[PDB]
Short mmCIF file of C-alpha atoms and ligand atoms in Angstrom, two decimals:
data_model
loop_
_atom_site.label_atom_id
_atom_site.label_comp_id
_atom_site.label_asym_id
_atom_site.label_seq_id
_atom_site.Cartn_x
_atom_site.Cartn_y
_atom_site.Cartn_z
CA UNK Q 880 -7.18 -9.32 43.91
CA UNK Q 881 -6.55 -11.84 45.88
CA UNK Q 882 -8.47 -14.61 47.06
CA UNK Q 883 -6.79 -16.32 50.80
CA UNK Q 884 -7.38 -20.06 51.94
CA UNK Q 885 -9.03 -20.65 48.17
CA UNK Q 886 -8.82 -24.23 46.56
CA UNK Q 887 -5.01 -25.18 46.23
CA UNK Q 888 -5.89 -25.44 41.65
CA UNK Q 889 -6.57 -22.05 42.37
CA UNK Q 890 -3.60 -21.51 44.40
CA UNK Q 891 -1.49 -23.31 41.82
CA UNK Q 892 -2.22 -21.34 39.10
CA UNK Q 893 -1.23 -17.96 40.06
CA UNK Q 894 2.03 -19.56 41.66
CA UNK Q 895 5.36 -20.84 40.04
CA UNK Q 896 5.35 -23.12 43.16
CA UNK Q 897 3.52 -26.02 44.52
CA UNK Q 898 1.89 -25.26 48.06
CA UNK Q 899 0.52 -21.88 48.07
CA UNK Q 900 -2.87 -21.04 49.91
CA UNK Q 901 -3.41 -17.63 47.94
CA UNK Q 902 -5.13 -17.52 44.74
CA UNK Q 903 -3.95 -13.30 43.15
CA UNK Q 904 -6.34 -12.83 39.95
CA UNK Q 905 -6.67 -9.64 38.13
CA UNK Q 906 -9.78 -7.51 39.38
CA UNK Q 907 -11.15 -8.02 35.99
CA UNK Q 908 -11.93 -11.72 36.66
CA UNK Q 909 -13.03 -12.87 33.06
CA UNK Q 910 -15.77 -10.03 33.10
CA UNK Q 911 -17.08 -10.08 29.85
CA UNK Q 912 -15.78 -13.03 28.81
CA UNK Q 913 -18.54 -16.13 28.03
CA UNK Q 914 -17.91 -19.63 29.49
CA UNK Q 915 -20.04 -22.79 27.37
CA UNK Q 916 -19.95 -25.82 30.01
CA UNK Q 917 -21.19 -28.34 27.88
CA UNK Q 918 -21.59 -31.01 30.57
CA UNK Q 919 -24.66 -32.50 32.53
CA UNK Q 920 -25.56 -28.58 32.91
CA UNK Q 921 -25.70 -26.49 35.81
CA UNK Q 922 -26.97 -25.77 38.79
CA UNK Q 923 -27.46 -22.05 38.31
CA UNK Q 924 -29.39 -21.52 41.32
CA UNK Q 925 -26.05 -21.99 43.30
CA UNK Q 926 -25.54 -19.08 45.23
CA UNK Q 927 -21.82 -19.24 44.23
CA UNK Q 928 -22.83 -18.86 40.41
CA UNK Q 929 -24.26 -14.68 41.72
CA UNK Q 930 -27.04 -15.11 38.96
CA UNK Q 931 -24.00 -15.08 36.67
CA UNK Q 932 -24.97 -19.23 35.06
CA UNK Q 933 -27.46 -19.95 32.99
CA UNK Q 934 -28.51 -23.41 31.57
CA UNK Q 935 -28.57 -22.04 27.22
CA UNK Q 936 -29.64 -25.84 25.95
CA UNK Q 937 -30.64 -29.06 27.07
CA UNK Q 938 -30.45 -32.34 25.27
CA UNK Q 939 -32.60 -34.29 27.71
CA UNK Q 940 -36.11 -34.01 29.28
CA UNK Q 941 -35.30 -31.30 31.78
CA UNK Q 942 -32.24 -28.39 31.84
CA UNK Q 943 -31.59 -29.40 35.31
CA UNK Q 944 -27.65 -30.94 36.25
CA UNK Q 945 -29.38 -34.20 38.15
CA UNK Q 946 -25.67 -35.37 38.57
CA UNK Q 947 -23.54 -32.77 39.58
CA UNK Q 948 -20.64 -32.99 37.04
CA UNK Q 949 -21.52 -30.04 35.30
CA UNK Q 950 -22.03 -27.59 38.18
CA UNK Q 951 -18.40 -28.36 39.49
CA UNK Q 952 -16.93 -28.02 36.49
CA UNK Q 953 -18.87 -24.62 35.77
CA UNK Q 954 -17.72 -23.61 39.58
CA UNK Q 955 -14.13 -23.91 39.08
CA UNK Q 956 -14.67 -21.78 36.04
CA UNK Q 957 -16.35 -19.41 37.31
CA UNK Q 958 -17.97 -19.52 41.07
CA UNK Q 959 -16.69 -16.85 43.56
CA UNK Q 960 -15.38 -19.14 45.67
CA UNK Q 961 -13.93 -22.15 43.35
CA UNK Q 962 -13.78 -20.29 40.06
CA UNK Q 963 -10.74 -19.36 37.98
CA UNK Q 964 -12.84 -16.39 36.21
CA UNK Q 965 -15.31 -14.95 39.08
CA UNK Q 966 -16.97 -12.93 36.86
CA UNK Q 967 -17.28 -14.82 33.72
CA UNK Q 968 -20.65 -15.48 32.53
CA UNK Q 969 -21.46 -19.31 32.41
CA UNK Q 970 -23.29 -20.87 29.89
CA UNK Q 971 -24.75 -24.36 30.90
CA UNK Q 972 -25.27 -26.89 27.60
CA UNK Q 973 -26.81 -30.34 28.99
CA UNK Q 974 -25.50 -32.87 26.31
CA UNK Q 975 -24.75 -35.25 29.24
CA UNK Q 976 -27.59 -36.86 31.09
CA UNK Q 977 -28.10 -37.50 34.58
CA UNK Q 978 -25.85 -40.38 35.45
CA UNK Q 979 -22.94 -38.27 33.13
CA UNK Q 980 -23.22 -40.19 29.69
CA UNK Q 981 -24.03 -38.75 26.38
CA UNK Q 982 -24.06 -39.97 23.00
CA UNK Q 983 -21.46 -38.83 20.40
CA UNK Q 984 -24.45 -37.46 18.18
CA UNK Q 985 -25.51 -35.41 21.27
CA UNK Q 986 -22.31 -34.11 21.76
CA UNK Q 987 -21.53 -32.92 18.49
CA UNK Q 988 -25.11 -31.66 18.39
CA UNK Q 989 -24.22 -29.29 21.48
CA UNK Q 990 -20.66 -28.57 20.83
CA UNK Q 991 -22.65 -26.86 17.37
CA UNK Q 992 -25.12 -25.47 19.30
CA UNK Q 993 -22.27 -23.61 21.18
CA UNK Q 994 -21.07 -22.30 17.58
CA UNK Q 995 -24.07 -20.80 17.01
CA UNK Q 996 -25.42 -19.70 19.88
CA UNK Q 997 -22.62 -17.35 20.68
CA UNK Q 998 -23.37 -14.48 18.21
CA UNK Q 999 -26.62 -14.36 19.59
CA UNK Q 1000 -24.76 -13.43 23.28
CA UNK Q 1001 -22.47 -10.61 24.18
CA UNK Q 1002 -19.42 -12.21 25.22
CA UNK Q 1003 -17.42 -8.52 24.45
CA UNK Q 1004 -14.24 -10.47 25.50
CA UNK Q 1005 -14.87 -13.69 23.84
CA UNK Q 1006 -16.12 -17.27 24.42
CA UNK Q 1007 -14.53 -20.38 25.77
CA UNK Q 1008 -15.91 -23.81 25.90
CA UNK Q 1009 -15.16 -26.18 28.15
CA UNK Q 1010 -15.49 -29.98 27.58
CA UNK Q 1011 -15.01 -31.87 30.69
CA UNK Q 1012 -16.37 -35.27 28.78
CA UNK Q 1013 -14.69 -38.11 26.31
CA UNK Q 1014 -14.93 -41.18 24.83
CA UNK Q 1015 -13.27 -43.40 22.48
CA UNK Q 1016 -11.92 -41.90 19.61
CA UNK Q 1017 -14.30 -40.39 17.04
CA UNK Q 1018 -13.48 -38.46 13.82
CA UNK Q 1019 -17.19 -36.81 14.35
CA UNK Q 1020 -16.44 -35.86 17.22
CA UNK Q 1021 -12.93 -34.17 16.90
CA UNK Q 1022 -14.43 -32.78 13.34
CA UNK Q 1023 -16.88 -30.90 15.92
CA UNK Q 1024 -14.71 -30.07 18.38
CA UNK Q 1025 -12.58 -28.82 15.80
CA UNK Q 1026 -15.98 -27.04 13.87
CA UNK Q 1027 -16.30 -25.35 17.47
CA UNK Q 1028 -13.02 -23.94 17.75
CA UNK Q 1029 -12.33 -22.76 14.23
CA UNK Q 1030 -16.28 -20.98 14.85
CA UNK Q 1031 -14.35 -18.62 17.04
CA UNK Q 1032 -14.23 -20.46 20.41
CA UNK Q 1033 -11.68 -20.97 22.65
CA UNK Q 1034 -12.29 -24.48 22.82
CA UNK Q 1035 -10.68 -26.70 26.18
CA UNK Q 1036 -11.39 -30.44 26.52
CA UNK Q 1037 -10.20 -33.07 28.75
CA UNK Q 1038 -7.66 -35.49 28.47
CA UNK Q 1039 -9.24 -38.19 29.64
CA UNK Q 1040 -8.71 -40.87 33.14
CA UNK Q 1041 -7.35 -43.43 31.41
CA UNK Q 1042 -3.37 -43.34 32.12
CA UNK Q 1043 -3.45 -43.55 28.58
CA UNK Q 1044 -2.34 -42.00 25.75
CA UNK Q 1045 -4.90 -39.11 24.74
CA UNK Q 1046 -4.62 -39.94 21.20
CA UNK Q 1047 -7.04 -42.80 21.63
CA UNK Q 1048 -9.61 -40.59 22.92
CA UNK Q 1049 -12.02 -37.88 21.40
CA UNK Q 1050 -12.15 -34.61 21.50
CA UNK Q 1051 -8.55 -35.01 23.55
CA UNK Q 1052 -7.43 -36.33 20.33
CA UNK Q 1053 -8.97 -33.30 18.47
CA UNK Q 1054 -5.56 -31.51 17.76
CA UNK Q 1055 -6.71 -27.72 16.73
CA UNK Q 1056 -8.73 -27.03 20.43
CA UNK Q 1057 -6.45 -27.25 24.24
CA UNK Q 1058 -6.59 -30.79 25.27
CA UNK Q 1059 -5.82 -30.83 29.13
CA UNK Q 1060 -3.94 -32.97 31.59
CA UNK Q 1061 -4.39 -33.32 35.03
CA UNK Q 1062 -1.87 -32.11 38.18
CA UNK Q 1063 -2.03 -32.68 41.65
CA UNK Q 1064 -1.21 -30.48 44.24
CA UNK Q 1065 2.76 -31.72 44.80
CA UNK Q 1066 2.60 -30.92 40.71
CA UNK Q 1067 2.66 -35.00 39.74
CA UNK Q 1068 0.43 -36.04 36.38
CA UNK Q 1069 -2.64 -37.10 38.38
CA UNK Q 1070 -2.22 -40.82 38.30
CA UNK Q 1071 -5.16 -41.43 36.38
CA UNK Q 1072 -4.13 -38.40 33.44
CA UNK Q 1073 -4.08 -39.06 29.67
CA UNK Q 1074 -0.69 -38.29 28.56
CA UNK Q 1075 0.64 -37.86 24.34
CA UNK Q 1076 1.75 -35.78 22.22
CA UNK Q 1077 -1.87 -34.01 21.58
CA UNK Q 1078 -1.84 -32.77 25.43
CA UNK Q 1079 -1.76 -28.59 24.83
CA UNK Q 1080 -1.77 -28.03 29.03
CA UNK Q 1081 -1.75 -29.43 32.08
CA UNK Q 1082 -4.30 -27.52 34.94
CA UNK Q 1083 -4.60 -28.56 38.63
CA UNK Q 1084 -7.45 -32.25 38.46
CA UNK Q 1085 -6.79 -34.04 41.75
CA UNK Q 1086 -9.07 -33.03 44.51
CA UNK Q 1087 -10.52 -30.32 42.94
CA UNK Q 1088 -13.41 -28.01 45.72
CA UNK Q 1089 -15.96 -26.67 43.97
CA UNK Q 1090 -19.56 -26.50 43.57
CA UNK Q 1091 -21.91 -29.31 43.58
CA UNK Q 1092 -25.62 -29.78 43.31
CA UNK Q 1093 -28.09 -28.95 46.18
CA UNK Q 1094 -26.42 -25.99 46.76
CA UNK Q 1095 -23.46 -27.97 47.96
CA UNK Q 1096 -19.45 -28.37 47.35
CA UNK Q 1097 -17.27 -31.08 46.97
CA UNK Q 1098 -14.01 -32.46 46.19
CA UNK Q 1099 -13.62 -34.70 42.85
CA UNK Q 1100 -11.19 -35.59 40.38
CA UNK Q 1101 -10.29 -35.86 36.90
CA UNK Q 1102 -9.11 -34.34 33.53
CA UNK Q 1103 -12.85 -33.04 34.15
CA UNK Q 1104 -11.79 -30.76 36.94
CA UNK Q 1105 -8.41 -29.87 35.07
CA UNK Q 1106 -9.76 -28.45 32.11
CA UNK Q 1107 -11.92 -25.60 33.76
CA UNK Q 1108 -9.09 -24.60 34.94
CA UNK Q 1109 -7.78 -23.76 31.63
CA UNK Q 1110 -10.76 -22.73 30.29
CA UNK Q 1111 -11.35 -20.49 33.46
CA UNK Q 1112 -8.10 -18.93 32.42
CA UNK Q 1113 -8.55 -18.38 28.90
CA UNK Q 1114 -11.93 -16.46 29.49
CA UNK Q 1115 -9.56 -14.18 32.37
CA UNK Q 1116 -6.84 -13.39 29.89
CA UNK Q 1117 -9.44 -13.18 27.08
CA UNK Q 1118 -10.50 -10.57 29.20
CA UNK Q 1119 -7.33 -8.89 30.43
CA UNK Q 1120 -6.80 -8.60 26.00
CA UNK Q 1121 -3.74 -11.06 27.14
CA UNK Q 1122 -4.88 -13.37 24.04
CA UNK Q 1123 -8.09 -13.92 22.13
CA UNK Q 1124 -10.17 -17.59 21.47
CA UNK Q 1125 -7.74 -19.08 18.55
CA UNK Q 1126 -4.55 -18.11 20.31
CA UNK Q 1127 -5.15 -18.97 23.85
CA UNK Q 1128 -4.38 -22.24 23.95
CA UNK Q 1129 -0.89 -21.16 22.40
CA UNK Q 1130 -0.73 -18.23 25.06
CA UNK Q 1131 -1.36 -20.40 27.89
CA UNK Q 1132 1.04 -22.88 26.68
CA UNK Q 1133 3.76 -20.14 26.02
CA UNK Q 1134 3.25 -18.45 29.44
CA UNK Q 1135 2.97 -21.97 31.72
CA UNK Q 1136 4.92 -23.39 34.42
CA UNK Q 1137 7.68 -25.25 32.59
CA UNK Q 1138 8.68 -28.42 33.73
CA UNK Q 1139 7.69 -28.23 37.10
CA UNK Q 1140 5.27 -31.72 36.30
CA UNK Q 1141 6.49 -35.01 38.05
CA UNK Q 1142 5.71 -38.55 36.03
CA UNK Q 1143 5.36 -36.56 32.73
CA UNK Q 1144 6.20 -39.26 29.99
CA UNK Q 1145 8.84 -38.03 27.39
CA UNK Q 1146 7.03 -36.73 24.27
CA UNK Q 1147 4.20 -35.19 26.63
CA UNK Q 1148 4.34 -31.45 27.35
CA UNK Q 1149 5.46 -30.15 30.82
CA UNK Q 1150 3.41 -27.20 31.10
CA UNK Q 1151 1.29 -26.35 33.89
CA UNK Q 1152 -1.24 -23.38 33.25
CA UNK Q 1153 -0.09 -20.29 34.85
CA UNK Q 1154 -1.96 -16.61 34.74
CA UNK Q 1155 1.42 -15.19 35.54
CA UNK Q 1156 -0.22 -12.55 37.79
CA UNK Q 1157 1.72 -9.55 38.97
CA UNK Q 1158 0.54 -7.67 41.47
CA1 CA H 382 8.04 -23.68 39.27
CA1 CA H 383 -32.18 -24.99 28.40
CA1 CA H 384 -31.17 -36.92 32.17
CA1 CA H 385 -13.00 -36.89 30.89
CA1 CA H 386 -4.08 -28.82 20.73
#
């Protein structure tokens, strides 16, 4: 398949090469495959979503993604027209509230929620969970981000936008789940990336199209954007039997654009994720 004109992150990861306009996906398209965005939820209304998203848990007075954060980040995993995995299903956890804060406690909370609430959903070719949120560094936090992954989850979380090194941050610092940088579209670290040793990946995060709320799209960046991306890929090969939920991080990482990354500090991987489609 091949989708033509589609957002240049799309585009970038079924290239070797910067520029391309042509996102080629398997058919398959992470069907069967289950996608946790544990964010400020999502719109699932969005006519890009198909009746594929669902909001599973909400952590605040109403399910609804009042901010927006959450719906792009579930449309580039999974929309038609901005997601990685077009046929995933999405699963919408609301541990962020409206203005895109959440406690630590709250976050843990959900990122255990996701844990559990899996075996009661078929997911045939597996789950992925993708945590497009961070703060300072927390041992609690990393523990759970760590409890979600080992539960059998292929667990992706951001970076973080603070030019920084990721180690200061949680769950980027977590090192068992994929913590993920942030491109552009001439392949540079987004400026405002985490970098470190504890980066797995690095997925397109600067100017990322996808859904917003209202039924609307827009452009936004951050290690947010990046890590659907990844975890938009892992559900596809998931799918495709390229790799299951412990391994994909490693699989991705193994099967990435290698050093193509401008402004990647020494001791920080130069990997860009890559579904190395062949027609
Ligand atoms: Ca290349
Ligand atoms: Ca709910
Ligand atoms: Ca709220
Ligand atoms: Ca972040
Ligand atoms: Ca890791």
């Amino acid at each position: 398949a091949a989708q033509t004109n589609a957002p240049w992150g799309l585009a970038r990861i079924s290239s070797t090469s910067p520029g391309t306009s042509t996102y080629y996906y398997d058919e398959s398209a992470g069907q069967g495959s289950c996608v946790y965005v544990i964010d400020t939820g999502i719109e699932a209304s969005h006519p890009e979503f198909e009746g594929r998203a669902q909001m599973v848990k909400t952590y605040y007075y109403s399910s609804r993604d009042g901010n927006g954060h959450g719906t792009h980040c579930a449309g580039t995993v999974g929309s038609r027209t901005y997601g990685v995995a077009k046929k995933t299903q999405l699963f919408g956890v609301k541990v962020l509230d409206d203005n895109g804060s959440g406690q630590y406690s709250t976050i843990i909370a959900g990122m255990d929620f996701v844990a559990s609430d899996k075996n009661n959903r078929n997911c045939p070719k597996g789950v992925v969970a993708s945590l497009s949120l961070g703060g300072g560094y927390s041992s609690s936090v990393n523990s759970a981000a760590a409890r979600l992954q080992s539960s059998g989850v292929m667990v992706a979380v951001a970076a973080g936008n603070n030019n920084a090194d990721a180690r200061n941050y949680s769950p980027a610092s977590e090192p068992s789940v994929c913590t993920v940088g942030a491109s552009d579209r001439y392949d540079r670290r987004s400026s405002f990336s985490n970098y470190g040793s504890v980066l797995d990946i690095f997925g397109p995060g600067t100017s990322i199209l996808s859904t917003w709320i209202g039924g609307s799209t827009r452009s936004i960046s951050g290690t947010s954007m990046a890590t659907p991306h990844v975890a938009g890929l892992a559900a596809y090969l998931m799918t495709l039997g390229k790799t299951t939920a412990a391994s994909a991080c490693r699989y991705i990482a193994d099967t990435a654009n290698k050093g193509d990354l401008s402004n990647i500090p020494f001791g920080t991987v130069n990997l860009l994720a890559y579904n190395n489609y062949q027609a």
